[PDB]
Amino acid sequence: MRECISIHVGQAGVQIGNACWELYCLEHGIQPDGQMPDDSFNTFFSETGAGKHVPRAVFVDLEPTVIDEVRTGTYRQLFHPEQLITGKEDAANNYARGHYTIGKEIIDLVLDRIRKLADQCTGLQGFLVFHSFGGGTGSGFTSLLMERLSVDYGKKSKLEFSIYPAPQVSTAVVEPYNSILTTHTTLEHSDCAFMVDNEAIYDICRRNLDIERPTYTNLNRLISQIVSSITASLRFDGALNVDLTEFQTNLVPYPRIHFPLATYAPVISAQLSVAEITNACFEPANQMVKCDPRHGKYMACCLLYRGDVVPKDVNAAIATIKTKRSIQFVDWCPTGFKVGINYQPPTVVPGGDLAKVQRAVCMLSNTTAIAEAWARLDHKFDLMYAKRAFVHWYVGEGMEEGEFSEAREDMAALEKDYEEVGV
Amino acid sequence: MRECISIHVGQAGVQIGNACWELYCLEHGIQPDGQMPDDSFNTFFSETGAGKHVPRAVFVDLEPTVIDEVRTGTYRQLFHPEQLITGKEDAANNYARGHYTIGKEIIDLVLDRIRKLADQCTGLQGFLVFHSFGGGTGSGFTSLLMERLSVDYGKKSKLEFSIYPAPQVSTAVVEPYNSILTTHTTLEHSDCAFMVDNEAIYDICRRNLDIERPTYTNLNRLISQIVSSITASLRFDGALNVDLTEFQTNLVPYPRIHFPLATYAPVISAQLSVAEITNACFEPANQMVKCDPRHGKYMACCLLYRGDVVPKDVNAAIATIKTKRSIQFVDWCPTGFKVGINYQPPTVVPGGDLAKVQRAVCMLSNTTAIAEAWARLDHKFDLMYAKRAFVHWYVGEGMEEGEFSEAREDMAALEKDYEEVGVD
Amino acid sequence: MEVIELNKATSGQSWEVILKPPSFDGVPPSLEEIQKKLEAAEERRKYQEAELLKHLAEKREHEREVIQKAIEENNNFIKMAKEKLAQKMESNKENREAHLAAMLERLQEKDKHAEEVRKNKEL
Amino acid sequence: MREIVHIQAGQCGNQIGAKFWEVISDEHGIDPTGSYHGDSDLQLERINVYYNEATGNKYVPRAILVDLEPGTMDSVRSGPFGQIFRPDNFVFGQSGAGNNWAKGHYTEGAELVDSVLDVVRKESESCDCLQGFQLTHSLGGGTGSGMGTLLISKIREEYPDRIMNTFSVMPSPKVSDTVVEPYNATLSVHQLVENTDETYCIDNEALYDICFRTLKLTTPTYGDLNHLVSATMSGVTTCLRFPGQLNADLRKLAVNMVPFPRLHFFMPGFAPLTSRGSQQYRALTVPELTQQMFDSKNMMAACDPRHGRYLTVAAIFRGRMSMKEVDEQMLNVQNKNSSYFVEWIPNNVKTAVCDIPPRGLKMSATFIGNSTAIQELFKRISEQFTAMFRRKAFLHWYTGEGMDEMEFTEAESNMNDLVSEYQQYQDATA
Amino acid sequence: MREIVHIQAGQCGNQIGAKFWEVISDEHGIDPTGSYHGDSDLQLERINVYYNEATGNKYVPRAILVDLEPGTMDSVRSGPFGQIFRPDNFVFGQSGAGNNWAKGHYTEGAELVDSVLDVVRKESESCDCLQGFQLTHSLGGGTGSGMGTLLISKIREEYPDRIMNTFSVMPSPKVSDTVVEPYNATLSVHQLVENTDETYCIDNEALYDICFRTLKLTTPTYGDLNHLVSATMSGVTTCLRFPGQLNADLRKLAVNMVPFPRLHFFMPGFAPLTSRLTVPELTQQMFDSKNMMAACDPRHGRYLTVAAIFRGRMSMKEVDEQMLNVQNKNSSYFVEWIPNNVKTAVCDIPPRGLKMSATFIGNSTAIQELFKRISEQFTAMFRRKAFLHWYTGEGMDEMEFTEAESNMNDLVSEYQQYQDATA
Ligand SMILES: Nc1nc2c(ncn2[C@@H]2O[C@H](COP(=O)(O)OP(=O)(O)OP(=O)(O)O)[C@@H](O)[C@H]2O)c(=O)[nH]1
Ligand SMILES: Nc1nc2c(ncn2[C@@H]2O[C@H](COP(=O)(O)OP(=O)(O)OP(=O)(O)O)[C@@H](O)[C@H]2O)c(=O)[nH]1
Ligand SMILES: COc1cc(C(=O)c2nc(-c3cccc4[nH]ccc34)c[nH]2)cc(OC)c1OC
Ligand SMILES: COc1cc(C(=O)c2nc(-c3cccc4[nH]ccc34)c[nH]2)cc(OC)c1OC
Ligand SMILES: Nc1nc2c(ncn2[C@@H]2O[C@H](COP(=O)(O)OP(=O)(O)O)[C@@H](O)[C@H]2O)c(=O)[nH]1
Ligand SMILES: Nc1nc2c(ncn2[C@@H]2O[C@H](COP(=O)(O)OP(=O)(O)O)[C@@H](O)[C@H]2O)c(=O)[nH]1
Ligand SMILES: [Mg+2]
C-alpha cells in the first residue's frame, strides 16, 4: 500500500479540499455517507469498523466559519471531528501572525492529528499540502508545518498545491508579502509544488465556460479536475506517477527548481480528438500559471491522458507538433515526453458548469518560463517594501524586519537559478 | 444635585432678590408658603419633609429696614428666618464700614448660614452674589464675603450680579469710591461678574415701557427678567442648557476680563421673530451697560433664548449676525457663539409693566467696549481723589490711603488689559 | 521519434517518446532550532507589549500628577487668601484703634488745660 | 441708627430748642401733654428718632435742657409745651455766665457739666441704636457758647463713635447782647472746628436782614428771628423724622456733605420766607421754590452763594408736587448756574421729597449747602474779633477767670486757617 | 473576532450613536422592543457582532452609553429606540464637563471612568471572541473629547491586543457649540494618533457644506448633519455586519488600510447624498470631493488605500469595471508603490429608502488639510493664550498644549512625506 495524507491549511486549502474530496468520491463511487458498493483508492481513503471510507485528510482553519462548512456540508459524514482543527481568531491576512503567533499555539496539536493518520499507514509515501500563498494562515502556518514535517518525517515526500495570488479575487493588499515569505521558508522543505494562478483559472472560467464573474466554487471546480488528473494514477492502478517519489523523478531535475507548470484540456461549458487536446497543451491560454514558455526551456515534460485515449493517436499527435513547433529543452536533458494513459474516464460534478468529456489530458512540464510568475510577485513585493509599507503589522507579531529582506534575497537567487539553467 | 446658592447683599441685592425669587415662584408654580401642586427647579429650591420648597438663598443687610419688609411681606413664609440676616447699623454709604467696622461683626454668622446651605447640596455648582457697587454694604461687605468664600470653598465658582451706579438713582456721592474699592478687592475672587448699569435700565424703562419716573420696583422687575434668563438654563430642563461652568468657560478669555455685557429683547409695554429679537441684542439701545460695541471687539457671545424658539431659527439668525461687518470679533476667536434654548416662555408678574411675549432672548457678550464703563467710573474717582475729597471718612474707619491708589492702579491695569486683548 | 515502453497496469499504460537526445552528456533546521525561533518571536511580542503598557502606565501617573497639582493650587489659593485677609483685618483694627486713641488723647489734653485754667484763677 | 439725643443750652439754645419741639410735635401730632392726636401713621413711623415712648400712651422728647441761669428754664416750663419735657432732664444752675465764654467753658459751666452728663447717659443707654447728638446754642453768649462747647467735648469723650451735630446761632451787632460776642463766637468756633461733625450756621445777621428787608418788620424781635430758625430746623430734620428713599440719618448726611473734616459748616436756606402766624394767600410753585431756594435772600447765613462755590447741596421739598417737575427744575438750576458748583465732585447736588408739608404751607423747600462762601461769615467774625483784640479790649473779663492771651491768638489763628482752606477749594481746578 | 463593544460618550457621541443603532436595527430587522421581525436570514447571520443574545428571542445592542451630564441619557432614553438598550449600560455623571477637555480628561472624567470600565469589562466577558471597540464622540467638546480619549487610553491598557476604532466628529466654526473647540480638538487628535488603530474623521465642516451646497438646505441643523453620519456609519460597518468573501473584521481593516501606524485617519464618503442612480455614477460620485465626510479635496493628495462597499442588486462586473476605469483615469491620485490598493466589496441588501448605495473608506494624504485647519485655529487662540486659564486651573501645563500641536503638525508632515514619495 502507498498511503498519502492530504493537509488543507487556510480557507483556500480547505475549500479546494472540499472540491477534490467530493470529486474523488464521484470517481471512486463513495457516497456522501461514506458507503461504497481496483483497490488503489485506499491510498487516499481509510476504512472504519462500520464499513465507512474516510479521507486521509486533516483540515486546519482557525476561523470556525470555513470548517463549519465541512462539519455541515454534503459530505460531512466522511470526516471525523479529530480531522478538523479550528480556533477563534484567524491570521488576519498576516503571515507573521499565522506562522509565529498562531503557529506556536497550534503546531503540536496539528502534528498530533497528522500522527494519528500516519499511524494508520503501512507505507506512507508523504503529504499533499493545499494552501494559499496570500492568506495569513495559508502562508504562515503552512511554512511552519512544512518545517516540522521535514523534522518528523525526514524521508517522506511533500507535494504542494499552492494558490498563487490574483487581484481579481484578492483578500488582502499584503498578499505579495505573505507569498514571498512562505516561498522562502518552504523552499528547502518541498519536493514538488504545483502552483495554481487564480488569475489563470479566472481567465479560463470566463473564456471557456462563459462565466462573467467566476466564484470560488467556479475556480475550485476547475482546480479539482487538475488535482484529480495529477493524483489519478495514485488513486487507481496507473502506470505513470504511481508514487510521490516518481513526481520529482519525472519532473524535478534540480531541487530548488521544483515548480512544474500544469496545462489542462479540454474545458467545455455544460468530442475533441486526441490531436486537438494535445495541441491545446501547448497554448498558454490553458496554463494554470500565466507565463510564456517561449521565454524558457523545458527540463521535463509529462502528458497525463485520461479516458478514451489510444497510444497510436498520442504518438501521431506528438509527431504533428514536433514538425510545426519548436520546443526547446535545456541542453543537458533529452527532448521528449513521458506519456501516461489512465483509462478511468474524466468525471465532473453533476450539475456543475464543466461538461463531461470523453477524453482529457493534463501536461505537467518544468519550464524556466514559470520564473516570470516569481518576477511579477517579486516586483509587487519590492514596490511596498521600499517604503516599508505595512511592515509594522509583521514586526508587531514578533517577526524581525530582516526576515523580509532575507526572504527577498532567496527569491532573487531563485530567479537567478532559473536564469542559469535556461541559458 | 447641581445646586446654586444665591447670596443677596445690601439693599440693592435684597430688593433685586425679591423681584427674582418672586419670579422664580411664578415660573415654577410655587406658592408663597413654599407649597406646590421637570425637577430642575431643585437646583434653586431645597425641599422639607412637608413638601415645602425653600430657596437656596441668604439675604444679608447690615440694617434691618429692607429685610424686615421681607419678614413681613408676601413671601415671609417662603424663607426660613435664619436665611434673613440683619444687623442694626448699616455701612453709612462707606465701604470701610461694610468691609471692616460694621461688617466684621456679622461675617461669621453669614458664613455659618451659608455653610449650612452648602451642607444641603450634593453637587454645589457655585455661588451667585447679588450686590451693588455704590452702597457701603453692597461694596464693602460683598468684598469681605467674597474673600471669606474663597477661603472656605477654594476655587469653587463665584459669580456676581453687580449694579453699576447711575446719578439718576444715586444714594451717595462717594459711590465711585465704593465701586473702585470693591472691584479691586473682589477681582481675584470672582470667576464671572454680570454688570447692570442702572442708567441703562433707567433709559429702557422710559423708551420701551413709557414710564416717566422709573422706581426701583420698575428697574428691578426688568432686572429680574434678565436674571431669570441667566438662571433658567439651571432651573429648567430645556433643549440647550448652559450650566455655571459653561458660562465661565465660554465668556471669560482671561481671569481679569470676566465682565460680560447683558442685553435683553423684547422689552414691550404691557410677536417678534427669532431674527428680530436676535438683531435687537446688538442694537446698543437694549444693552444693560451704557457703551458702544461698534467701537469695540467681541470676544464671546452667549445667547440664551426662552419660549417658542426653534434651533433652525437661531442658526439662521446667528448666521446673519456673522455677516454684519459692524459686529467685529477679535483675531484670536475662531468662533465666539454659545447658544442656549429653554422652552418655557418668559413669565411676567401680573400687575407689572412688561407684556407677555411668546419668545425672548438674553445675550451675554464679552466685548472690549465695556471698558468705556470702567473709564467713566475711574474718571469720577479721579475727580474727587485728586483732592482727597471724602477720603477722611474711610481713613477714620482704619483704611489707609495706599489702599485707594492701589485700587485705582488695578483699574488702570484693567483698562490697559482691555486695550491689549483688542489688538491683532 | 524513438518510442520506449515504460509500464502497463490495470488502469493504464505509460511509455516515453524521445524526439532528440541531449546535446550534453550528463547533468551539470532541527526541532530545537525551530522552537528557538518561535520562542524568540514570542519574547519580542511580549517585550513590545510590556513597553506599550509601560508608556500607558507613565500616562496614568501623569494623570495623577495633574489632578494632584490642581489640588495643590486650590490649597495654596486658600492659604494665601487666608493670610492676606487676616493681614488687612488686623491692620485695619490697629489703624482704627489708633485713631480713636489719638482723638481721646487730644480731648484729654484739653481736660488737663481746663485744670490749669481753674488753677490760674484761684492763683 | 434711630435715636437722636437732643441738647439745648443757654437762653438762645433753649428758646430755639423749645420752638423746635413745638413745631415738630405738631408735625407728628403730639399735644403739650405728650399724647398722639394725629391722623396719619407716617407721623409715628420714625417718631422714635426724637421721642421716647413713656407708658400711658405718651411721647416724651429725648431732650436735655441746660442753663447756668435759672430763669430761662422757668420760662420753658411756662411756655407752650413746657409740660411735655421730662422734668428730670432740666439741669439749671443759679448764676449765668454773664455773656462770658470762660465762665461757661472753664469755671461755672464746668461745675454743672457732670450734672448734665448724668441725664445724657440715662437717655443714651436707653437707646436701641444711637445716631448721635444735636445741640442748639448761641455762640455769642456764655452758657451756650462756653458750656455748650464744653458739653460737646465731654460727650465726645464718652461717645466718640457717634455723630455730633449742632445748630449754632452766630452773633450780629444788629441783634447784640454784648460787645464781646466776637470773642465768644471765635472761641466757640475753634471748638466746633475740632469736635463736631456737622454744624448748621444760623446767622442772626441774615435773620435780622430777612425780617427787616423781606418781611418789612421795622423792629424785629427774637420771636421774629426764631420763626425762621424753627422753619429751618424742621426742614433740615425732615429726612430724619419721616420715611423716604435715602433712609437718611446723621452719619449719611455727614459722609456725603463733608468732603474735608474741618469744612462741615452748612449754609441753610428756606423757601418760602414768611412772618410768624401769617396766612399764605398764594402757595409757591416748583420753579418758584427752586429759584428762590438758591437765592441769597433765602440764606440763613449772611453770605452770598454767588461769591463762592458749592461743594455739596442737599435739598428737601415738602408738599404734594411732581417729583418729575422737581427733578427738572433742580437739574436745570445746576446746568444754568454751573459756575457756582465745584466741578470735581460729581453728582454733588441731591434732592429729596416728602409729601407732608409743614404747618401753614402747601409747599416748601429747604436747602442745605456746603458752600465756600461761608468764609464770609467767618471773615466777618474775624474782623470784629481783631478790632477788639488789637486793643486787648475786655481781655480782663477772660483772664480774670483763668484764661491766657495765647488761647485767644490760637482760636483766631484756627478760624483764619479755616478761611484759607475754604478759599483753597474755592479756587481749586479740575 | 466576533463581537464589537460599542461606546458612545458625550452629547454628540450619544446623539449619533443613537442614530446609528436606530439605522442598523432597521437593517437587521429589530424593533425598538428588541424582537426580530425581519424577512431574511442574511440579517441574523452576523447580528451577534453588535447585538447580544438575550433570553426570549430578544437582541440587545452591545452598547455602553456614557456622559458626564445626565440630560443626554434622558434624551436617548425617550428617543425612538430608547428602550432597546440595556438599562444598566447607562453610565452618567452629574456635573457635566463644561466644554472643557481638561475636565473630561483629568478631573470629572476620572471620577466616572472606573464606573464605565466596569460596564465595559462585563460586556467583554460575555464575548466568545472580542474583536475590539468602536467609540463615537466629538473632539470639540469636553466629555466625548477629554473623557473619551481617557477611556481609550485606559481600555488600551486593559486590552492591549484589541482593535480600537473611533468615529470622531471634527468641529467647525460653521456649527460650533463652544469657543474652545480648537483646544479640545487638538488635545484629542494627539491622543488619537497614539492610541487608536482606525479613526473615521467625520468633519462637521463637510457635513454642513454638503447640506448647504448640495442638499440646498439653507440653514442646516444637527438633524440634517446626523442624517449623513448615520448613512456613513451604516455603510462603513456593512462588511462587519453582513457575510461576504472578505469575512471582514476590524483587525483586517487595519492591516490592509494602515501602511504606517500613525496614518490611520480615514476619509469617509457616501453616494447618493440625500436630504431627510447608476453604477458609473456611484463610482464617480464616490471619489468626488462633494461626497467626502471630511473637508478635504482628495484631488489635493493621493490615496494610499481605498476600501469601497456597494449595496444593492447590481452587476459586480460593471462595478469592478468602473472602479478599475476610475483608477486608470485618475492614476495620479493613487500611490504607485502599493499594488492593488483599491478593494471592492458588495452586499445585496440596500440601505433603507435607497435601492443602490456606495460607501467609501479612503486613506488619503489630503486628510492633512483637516488637521492643518484645526492647527490654524489652535494657533490663533493659543498665541494669545486665550481661555488657557480654564485648562491650567484644572492642573494642565502649557507644555501639553504645545506637545499636542507639534504631534499634530508632525502627522501633517508625515502625510506630506508620503504624498511626495515615488517609485
Ligand atoms: N482558488 C481559490 N482561491 C481561494 C479560495 N479561497 C481563498 N482563496 C485565495 O486565497 C487567498 C487568501 O488566503 P486564504 O487561504 O483564503 O485565507 P487565510 O490564509 O485563511 O487568511 P487569514 O484570514 O489570514 O487566516 C486569496 O488570494 C484568495 O483569492 C478558494 O476557495 N479558491
Ligand atoms: N437697580 C436697583 N438699584 C438699587 C436698588 N437699591 C439701591 N440701588 C442702587 O444701589 C446703590 C446704593 O447701594 P445700596 O445697595 O442701596 O446700599 P447698601 O448696600 O444698603 O449700603 P449702605 O446703605 O450704605 O449700608 C445706588 O447706586 C442705588 O442706585 C434697587 O432696588 N434696584
Ligand atoms: C472593500 O470594503 C471593505 C473592506 C473591508 C476589509 O476588511 C478589507 N479591506 C481590504 C483591502 C483594503 C484596501 C486594499 C486592498 N487590497 C486587497 C484587499 C484590500 C481587505 N479587507 C472592511 C470594510 O468595512 C468594514 C469595507 O467596507 C468599506
Ligand atoms: C437731600 O436731602 C437730604 C439728604 C440727607 C442724606 O442723608 C444724604 N445726602 C446725600 C447726598 C448729599 C449731597 C450730594 C449727594 N449725591 C448723592 C447723594 C448725596 C446722601 N444722603 C440728609 C438730609 O437731612 C438730614 C437731607 O435733607 C436736606
Ligand atoms: N436767633 C436768636 N438769637 C438769640 C436768642 N436769644 C439770644 N440770642 C443771641 O444769643 C447771643 C446771646 O447769647 P445767650 O443765649 O443769650 O447767652 P447764654 O444764655 O449765656 O448762652 C446774642 O448773639 C443774641 O443775639 C433767640 O431766641 N434767637
Ligand atoms: N455632527 C454632530 N455634531 C455635534 C452634535 N452635537 C454636538 N456636536 C459637535 O460636538 C462639539 C461639542 O461637543 P459635545 O458633544 O456637544 O460636548 P460633550 O458632551 O462634552 O462631548 C461641537 O463641535 C458640536 O458641533 C450632533 O448631534 N451632530
Ligand atoms: Mg442698607
- Assigned fold of E370-420: Helix Hairpins (1.10.287)
Domain, as residue range, for C63: 29-123
Say if CB E368 and CB E294 are below 8 A apart: no
Residue nearest to atom 7 of ligand 2 (CA): B12
Residue of chain C whose alpha carbon sits nearest to that of A232: C11
Continuous H helices in B154-270: 175-187, 198-207, 216-235, 244-251
- Is E336–A383 a contact, with Cβ atoms under 8 angstroms apart? yes
**Is D368 near ligand 4, meaning CB less than 6 Å away?**
yes
Would you kindly state where each structural domain of chain E is located, as residue ranges? Answer: 3-268, 269-369, 370-420
Instruction: Please list, residue by residue across A17-51, b when 16 or more beta carbons sit within 10 angstroms of its beta carbon and e when fewer do.
Output: bbbbbbbbbbbbebeeebeeeeebbbbbbbeeeee
Of the candidates C100, C106, C114, which has its C-beta nearest D106's C-beta?
Answer: C114
How remote is the CA of residue D401 from the centroid of ligand 5, in Å? 22
- Is A88–E129 a contact, with Cβ atoms under 8 angstroms apart? yes
Residue D60 has a CB neighbour count (10 Å cut-off) of 17
Q: Architecture of domain E269-369 in CATH? A: 2-Layer Sandwich (3.30)
Contacts of E365 in chain A (CB under 8 A): none
Min Cα separation B143/chain C (Å): 11
Q: Does E205 carry a binding-site annotation?
A: no
Class of domain B370-424: mainly alpha
Q: Which residues pair with A364 in a beta bridge?
A: A262, A302
Q: What is residue A187's DSSP assignment?
A: G
Min Cα separation C28/chain A (Å): 7
- Is B92–D430 a contact, with Cβ atoms under 8 angstroms apart? no
CATH superfamily of A370-423: Helix hairpin bin (1.10.287.600)
Say if CB C16 and CB A338 are below 8 A apart: yes
Q: Does B422 carry a binding-site annotation?
A: no
| Structure method | X-ray
Domain assignment of residue C12, yes or no: no
Q: Measured between alpha carbons, how far is residue C7 from residues C10, C12, C15, E80, E279 in Å?
A: 10, 9, 7, 79, 60
Q: Please report, as a single letter, which amino acid is at residue B129.
A: V
Phi, psi of E168 (to 5 degrees): -115, 115
Domain assignment of residue C38, yes or no: yes
Q: Please check whether residue C89 touches B, CB under 8 A.
A: yes
Q: Please, which residues have CB less than 5 A from ligand 7, an ion?
A: B 11, 63, 90
Class of domain D269-376: alpha beta
Compute the distance between CA of residue A92 and CA of residue A100 in angstroms, rounded to an integer: 13
Q: What is A334-349 written as a DSSP string?
A: -EEEEEEEE-SPP---
Q: What is residue D173's DSSP assignment?
A: T
How remote is the CA of residue E207 from the centroid of ligand 3, in Å? 24
Domain assignment of residue C47, yes or no: yes
Region of residue C120 (phi > 0: left; psi between -120 and 50: alpha; otherwise: beta):
alpha
**CATH, domain range A261-369:** 3.30.1330.20
Q: Please report, as a single letter, which amino acid is at residue E304.
A: L
Continuous H helices in A325-400: 371-385, 391-395
Compute the distance between CA of residue A303 and CA of residue A240 in angstroms, rounded to an integer: 9
Say if CB D384 and CB D180 are below 8 A apart: no
**Is D256 near ligand 4, meaning CB less than 6 Å away?**
yes
Q: Is the peptide bond before D220 cis (omega within 30 degrees of 0)?
A: no
Q: Measured between alpha carbons, how far is residue B58 from residues B9, B10, B194 in Å?
A: 8, 11, 19
Sign of CA dihedral D408, D411, D416, D417: positive
Compute the distance between CA of residue B87 and CA of residue A193 in angstroms, rounded to an integer: 104
β-strands B45-47, B53-55 pairing: antiparallel
Compute the distance between CA of residue A195 and CA of residue A172 in angstroms, rounded to an integer: 19
Of the candidates C110, C116, C120, which has its C-beta nearest D153's C-beta?
Answer: C110
Sign of CA dihedral D43, D37, D322, D50: negative
How remote is the CA of residue B388 from the centroid of ligand 7, in Å? 25
CATH of the domain at C62: 6.10.280.30
Contacts of C1 in chain A (CB under 8 A): 315, 318-319, 322, 336
Phi, psi of E340 (to 5 degrees): 60, 55
Q: Could you give the number of structural domains in chain C?
A: 1
Say if CB E378 and CB E187 are below 8 A apart: no
Among the listed residues B23, B2, B8, the one whose alpha carbon sits nearest the alpha carbon of residue B351:
B23
Compute the distance between CA of residue D296 and CA of residue D284 in angstroms, rounded to an integer: 18
Q: Which helix (H) or strand (E) holds A165?
A: none
Atom of ligand 4 nearest to the CA of D248: 7
Collapsed DSSP state (helix, strand, coil) of residue A229: helix
Collapsed DSSP state (helix, strand, coil) of residue A88: coil
Q: What residues in chain B have their Cβ under 8 A from chain E's Cβ atoms? A: 1-2, 122-123, 125, 155, 237, 241, 243, 245-246, 248-250, 252-255, 300, 311-313, 315-316, 319, 331-339, 421
Would you kindly state where each structural domain of chain B is located, as residue ranges? Answer: 1-260, 261-369, 370-424
Angle among Cα C76, C79, C80 to the nearest 5 degrees reads 85
Of the candidates A100, A336, A338, which has its C-beta nearest C19's C-beta?
Answer: A336
Q: Cell numbers at residue D30, please?
A: 403730639
The angle that helices A136-152 and A102-118 make with each other, rounded to 10 degrees, is 50
Atom of ligand 1 nearest to the CA of A141: 19
Compute the distance between CA of residue E135 and CA of residue E7 in angstroms, rounded to an integer: 5
Among the listed residues B255, B226, B258, the one whose alpha carbon sits nearest the alpha carbon of residue B363:
B226
Q: What is residue E81's DSSP assignment?
A: T
Q: Please report, as a single letter, which amino acid is at residue E177.
A: D
Q: Measured between alpha carbons, how far is residue B166 from residues C48, D345, E306 in Å?
A: 71, 14, 68
Q: Please check whether residue C76 touches B, CB under 8 A.
A: no
| E-only strand ranges, D46-162 | 51-54, 58-61, 63-67, 90-92, 130-138
- Is D1–B392 a contact, with Cβ atoms under 8 angstroms apart? no
Q: Resolution (in Å) of the shown entry?
A: 2.4
Compute the distance between CA of residue A11 and CA of residue A22 in angstroms, rounded to an integer: 17
Q: Helix/strand/coil (H, E, C) string of D276-331?
A: CCCCCCCCCCHHHHHHHHCCHHHECCCCCHHHCCEEEEEEEEEECCCHHHHHHHHH
Compute the distance between CA of residue D365 and CA of residue D269 in angstroms, rounded to an integer: 8
Q: Helix/strand/coil (H, E, C) string of E177-209?
A: CCCCHHHHHHHHHHHHHHHCCEEEEEEHHHHHH
Say if CB D203 and CB D236 are below 8 A apart: no
- Assigned fold of D3-268: Rossmann fold (3.40.50)
Q: Please report, as a single letter, which amino acid is at residue A135.
A: G
Binding-site residues, ligand 2, Cβ < 6 A? B 10-12, 15-16, 62, 90-93, 132, 134-138, 163, 165, 169-171, 175, 198, 216, 219-220, 223
How remote is the CA of residue D13 from the centroid of ligand 5, in Å? 7
Q: Please check whether residue E191 touches C, CB under 8 A.
A: no
Q: Please check whether residue C18 touches E, CB under 8 A.
A: no
**CATH, domain range D377-427:** 1.10.287.600
Q: Cell numbers at residue A201, please?
A: 483559472
Compute the distance between CA of residue A370 and CA of residue A382 in angstroms, rounded to an integer: 19
Residue E398 has a CB neighbour count (10 Å cut-off) of 12
Q: Please check whether residue E376 touches C, CB under 8 A.
A: no
Just list the catalytic residues of A.
246
CATH superfamily of B1-260: Tubulin/FtsZ, GTPase domain (3.40.50.1440)
In chain B, residues preceding a discontinuity (C to N beyond 2.5 A) are 37, 270
Residue among B147, B199, B246, B415 flagged as catalytic? B246
Compute the distance between CA of residue B373 and CA of residue B287 in angstroms, rounded to an integer: 12
Ligand 6 mutation target, pool E91, E151, E169, most atoms within 8 A of CB:
E169
Q: Which helix (H) or strand (E) holds D159?
A: none
Q: Which ligand has an atom closest to residue D184 CA?
A: 5
Q: Does B18 carry a binding-site annotation?
A: no
Of the candidates C103, C104, C118, which has its C-beta nearest D106's C-beta?
Answer: C118
Q: What is E336-397 written as a DSSP string?
A: SSSTT-EEEEEESSPPTT-S-EEEEEEEEGGGHHHHHHHHHHHHHHHTTTTTTHHHHTTT--
First CA to last CA distance, chain C: 176
